[PDB]
Write a protein that binds this DNA or RNA. Structure first.
Ligand SMILES: Nc1ncnc2c1ncn2[C@@H]1O[C@H](COP(=O)(O)OP(=O)(O)O)[C@@H](O)[C@H]1O
Ligand SMILES: Nc1ncnc2c1ncn2[C@@H]1O[C@H](COP(=O)(O)OP(=O)(O)O)[C@@H](O)[C@H]1O
Ligand code: ALF
Ligand code: ALF
Ligand SMILES: [K+]
Ligand SMILES: [K+]
Ligand SMILES: [K+]
Ligand SMILES: [Mg+2]
Ligand SMILES: [Mg+2]
Lengths: 442, 413
DNA sequence: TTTTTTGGGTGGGTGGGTGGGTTTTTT
């Protein structure tokens, strides 16, 4: 709404120059995604906008990076033809990639390094340009490395990522050795514009200030905050969001219908994208987990269950006001094991999980909230924070201090920091990100 | 009460000419295999009769291609000496191939292109005639490309076939670049001669007319049709046939005997001929999996069981009305349940009553046509549900073969 | 510990096949 003076000056810095790699970053709520809209309508069809999560893709009026490139939901081994499959000779995506001019990538901080490198390789190989990063496509990335770090399941996946790239962050990709990333910073908060004192407290919390932390507990710790009408609960873990959605569900007058999931092979309960014994009444707030094969709904689309029958569920979407019918999807559990004949790690399906792609959305994980502006939010701390950027994203969703509430006081012992982000954030004050070597692997 | 005149015309054409390769083709039930019996008598039993499936081999009074050349049950790579191995210096098979004059091959539509090519090569190498197709053996092929297509397993021998032949059908074999195939056509149906209206419906279904499909749906749909005694259920998929074989057994009064086998060395659970364990009850239609050295039973005759105690298998056949005893060899008794069967196992048979349980639907070219053409009268055919036009499967290769053979010749360039 | 995405037929053909894979034979 309205480009600010620092927004419009980034707009011209990024549009009227031939340099093909730009990053627009800044604290939460500075208007990065709103500047994306202004860029969306200049390039306006010459640009493909994408984001790593469904929620962030809907906020940016685009698609998930996986959905567009048709990437699988597993480790994308470096330029591996098993994972980065090239599109068909007469495919819609081939023309899409071949005529593409600009690619806008929002919430780039949550983009794991293998995902970014897969995009590079996908664009290079299909566009006939092995010598130019992203095949010659002007890439305009927007995000914040102080917000949620990428999801790296410990074990073989994390070891492959460390050995191949040194770390998981998008800025640790090797493509940045081939092209310098011009950095443009937005400072003035537009989400909390009319509450400057709250915005300043969030700035100090971004710099790990301990006295800002103790002030925050003094002002925003109210355990009853989850009960206030129309406020969303955020939570670090999925199972903590279920236990809290539980009570607002059994406070609705509708008849219960339980959708039961079928699991085959080895698929642990800890890996469930939603609950195997999932109950819903009508009028319940829900979020969708998978994109519609025919594009009537998407991953991260919010809505209200509208009528529910044995295996066919229909929900009124909040995005567009249309009633969509949700038939159950299948999830696969993937395990990576070293193959000694071909001398590489290979992914293996070991179990499956089919269930309706929905979970109640009175309480959500912080990951599904990143990108949104919320009216009010209550953060249920649960068993604690585990991800770099988790606390910050939760606290930055609202416009006003009064709109924020906490489950319990947070201590300085649970602040998390990543040395790689500190190296990145320090270097890009100079204005660009150009790497000479790769990152070391430990 | 003998051969039809067009059966005689085809007989005289393949026997009174100098041409080395012939194809007798026509719609289902036209008497192709009946003509084959005449060819066998004409060549005084010195011809060799092969067929791609055990059902077709038993129907043709011959044996499977694989059994004769001792090919393995995998892809047969082009002229590959580790897939196509010739017999030893004094093998009965070597003497058989060296003295062979005529090879009759029934249900050629189901012969996959690598099978035909392996036959060509096996006969060339063994007979030491490398520049003559089939080693100079006169080949008489009989079959129908609008019946079941050859099976391309869901490994990807499919692309090796695409890379090496461009398709699985027998007429895509490279031997047709060296020899022309003389095509003789039969038109009038003998299996449905008593029901000309039904024969004319099948003719119309053969060419895909949808007004005929609606008439078939309104006439032959009877879900209760598989519960009549004596009728055989055909299914598209193997486990669908086993799933309906078990209820007919479980509902049957009289209580079972369980047969399980012996293991030795290395054997995966479906490397065995029949399934791990087998429960049977006296008075049950089931059919055999292999022949025996003397000659009393044959792989593909079905009936009921008269007595049953653990290792003598007293069961009464239909082929003769005669008697058999089955005892296993390496290791289980080669008998499987036969209330429901795949349509692949039924191609070539003339059946008294047939019910097509469609299950999840048809998936192969010619699958529906075979199931409908087994019986003599329309009243002998029942369907579990009506057929939709979007279930008709057509391979374009078959249309170019069917079109180019209208001048009597098939060859490749 | 959080994200991304779909594979079988006891999920079921009024959900549809340009959402996409699989069935069948041969010792
Ligand atoms: N220039 C602006 N003027 C007024 N409001 C703005 C402006 N830029 C952003 N906003 C508001 O700030 C809120 C969050 O901005 P957003 O674009 O989500 O920032 P970011 O992408 O940096 O988190 C939005 O609700 C938007 O309306
Ligand atoms: N000339 C004929 N006279 C009487 N019956 C015949 C004649 N030819 C074939 N039949 C009968 O028609 C049925 C189908 O014949 P078959 O040889 O199996 O056809 P095809 O192999 O072409 O499908 C069999 O019952 C057969 O006995
Ligand atoms: F930086 Al944001 F919503 F995109 F806080
Ligand atoms: F062609 Al047939 F039975 F051999 F119909
Ligand atoms: K299907
Ligand atoms: K499906
Ligand atoms: K399906
Ligand atoms: Mg944003
Ligand atoms: Mg025949």
């Amino acid at each position: 709404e309205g480009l600010s003076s620092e927004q419009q000056r980034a707009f011209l810095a990024v549009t009227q120059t031939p340099h093909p790699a730009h990053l627009i970053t800044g604290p939460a709520g500075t208007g990065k995604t709103t500047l994306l809209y202004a860029l969306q309508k200049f390039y306006k069809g010459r640009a493909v906008t994408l984001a790593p999560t469904g929620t962030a893709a809907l906020q940016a009026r685009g698609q998930t990076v996986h959905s567009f490139f048709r990437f699988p939901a597993r480790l994308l081994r470096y330029r591996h033809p098993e994972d980065i499959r090239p599109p068909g000779p007469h495919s819609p995506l081939r023309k899409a990639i071949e005529q593409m001019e600009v690619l806008i990538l929002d919430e780039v901080g949550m983009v794991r390094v293998d995902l970014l490198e897969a995009m590079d390789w996908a664009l290079r190989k299909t566009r006939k340009r092995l010598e130019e990063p992203f095949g010659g496509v002007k890439v305009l990335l927007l995000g914040d490395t102080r917000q949620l770090e990428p999801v790296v399941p410990g074990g073989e996946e994390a070891l492959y990522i460390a050995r191949t790239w040194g770390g998981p962050f998008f800025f640790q990709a090797h493509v940045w050795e081939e092209v310098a990333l011009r950095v443009h910073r937005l400072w003035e908060s537009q989400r909390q514009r009319e509450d400057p004192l709250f915005a300043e407290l969030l700035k100090r919390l971004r710099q790990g200030d301990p006295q800002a932390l103790e002030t925050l507990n003094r002002a925003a710790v109210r355990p009853d905050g989850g009960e206030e009408p129309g406020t969303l609960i955020l939570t670090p873990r999925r199972k903590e969001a279920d236990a809290l959605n539980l009570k607002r569900l059994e406070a609705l007058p509708g008849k219960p219908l339980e959708y039961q999931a079928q699991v085959k092979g080895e698929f642990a309960e800890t890996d469930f994208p939603t609950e195997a014994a999932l109950t819903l009444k009508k009028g319940a707030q829900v979020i969708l987990l998978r994109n519609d094969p025919l594009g009537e709904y998407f991953n991260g689309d919010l809505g209200w269950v509208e009528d529910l029958e044995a295996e066919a569920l229909a929900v009124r979407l909040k995005r567009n006001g249309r009633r969509v019918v949700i038939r159950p999807f299948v999830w696969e559990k993937i395990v990576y094991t070293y193959d000694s004949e071909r001398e590489e790690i290979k992914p293996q399906v070991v179990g499956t999980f089919r269930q309706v792609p929905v979970r109640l959305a009175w309480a959500l994980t912080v990951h599904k909230a990143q990108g949104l502006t919320l009216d009010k939010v209550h953060l249920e701390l649960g068993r604690g924070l585990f991800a770099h950027g988790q606390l910050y994203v939760a606290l930055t969703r609202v416009r006003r201090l009064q709109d924020l509430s906490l489950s319990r006081p947070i201590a300085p012992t649970e602040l998390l920091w990543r040395p790689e982000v500190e190296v990145f954030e320090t270097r890009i004050q100079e204005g660009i990100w150009q790497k000479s070597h790769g990152w070391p692997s430990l």
